[PDB]
Homo-oligomer: 117 residues x 4
């Protein structure tokens, strides 16, 4: 149920393949200048008791056109059904000097759906 | 650089390779083979040249051939090179839960990695 | 209109707060989840002179999960901002830390996000 | 309780607190220099009847970054636990939320961690 195209609440798109070995691979777009590689992992044998499927992935914000010197990790769970969702919290760390490291990391949350909001 | 064997402050072992394409690959051990897990992630392969660190992140899903915790951790942070290289991170650990239990699904913390055991 | 009032989060918890002229938040919190029963004391702070450029009003508060009925040996802090409008809202992210031994400290802190409205969802 | 007194974090900040019998935390948060323009009110809560099994004491507090001299339109909450002894510590994680427009709310909140000791670093 994970493989395919997902859309967050703020206009980003997330195209992922969930491989048989637990791999997540794909592209994240916040135009080619805005598309970035993503990789991660998911539980390939989740429980069948109503619990979600744990997963996570990373995007480093560098491509052939731009580089923000930063990276976001999303940690969350996939929930299947008629209104399937991937519910996540995220951390976005920028490369900083030591003096600025205290303010290097933003935190937030993203909800992804199989239909554009 | 990033490629190498790292240890967090609690003794976990992080064996990583940073590839030319921005890929992180390797294994994470939270001393036995039953405790070794696949990791994948990404890093900035062209960092700034002003003294700033190198941003990165990776994920471990806590399933291997021997155990399955139905959970996954992501680490987000930066590599700081120099005399004692370090990777400073903050992490999120999400378990698969029912909807009624989702409010308590995610733990948060911080790990610092060096090339020497604690 | 303003922060003072009774708010409900997406799970039905009840947040009764007064925003004082000196920047103080005081009131009570009743949790719809966890090892909790009845009302708990909260205190916190808010920006009593927010920017005039359309930005929200920053704030934060703490509940220690001890009252006359129960003690969970834990505390939650909510950090967020109030956003005025036709449907006023307080958007927060929270940290819930339990008292633990050192060996268990790595798993002492849960994290999440709560959104509050003056209308109970 | 062991919490009342002056604490110092890893980056020079100084945390001056009174732990009341009812679970109240009150005091002042300032820089290493301690000039008036760096001092802010703090309020929070702690578990006034912690467990007796060697666990820490859960607590939290908030500072809104407004005083009589400046206003950054933001607030920080620290969530953590106090651990007593000859090397007493308060180990925390924190969230710093700035007031923003809706378009910028995704980048409103920083996260980090502070460790406080009874002696200057
Ligand atoms: C223009 O470069 C980008 O596309 C870009 C750049 C940065 C950055 O830190 O640069 C200052 C951050 C993001 C970003 C997206 C995103 C998301 O969708 N959910 C979670 C966080 C998040 O962060 C995207
Ligand atoms: C036997 O299962 C494990 O080895 C295992 C299981 C879980 C789990 O949450 O299972 C529900 C979590 C970890 C783990 C390690 C680790 C770390 O080193 N830094 C950051 C967090 C973290 O989480 C390891
Ligand atoms: C004179 O103003 C200050 O000294 C000052 C101002 C701000 C501010 O305006 O934030 C927008 C923030 C801090 C501060 C300290 C601190 C800390 O110790 N741990 C966690 C974060 C943190 O933030 C100090």
């Amino acid at each position: 149920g994970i493989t395919g195209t997902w859309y967050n609440q703020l206009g980003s798109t997330f195209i992922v393949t969930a491989g048989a070995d637990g791999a997540l691979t794909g592209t994240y777009e916040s135009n080619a200048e805005s598309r970035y590689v993503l990789t991660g992992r998911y539980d390939s044998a989740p429980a069948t008791d109503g619990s979600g499927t744990a997963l996570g992935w990373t995007v480093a914000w560098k491509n052939n056109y731009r580089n923000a010197h930063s990276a976001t990790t999303w940690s969350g769970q996939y929930v299947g059904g008629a209104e399937a969702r991937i519910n996540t919290q995220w951390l976005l760390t920028s490369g900083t000097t030591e003096a600025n490291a205290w303010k290097s990391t933003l935190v937030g949350h993203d909800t992804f759906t199989k239909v554009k909001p």
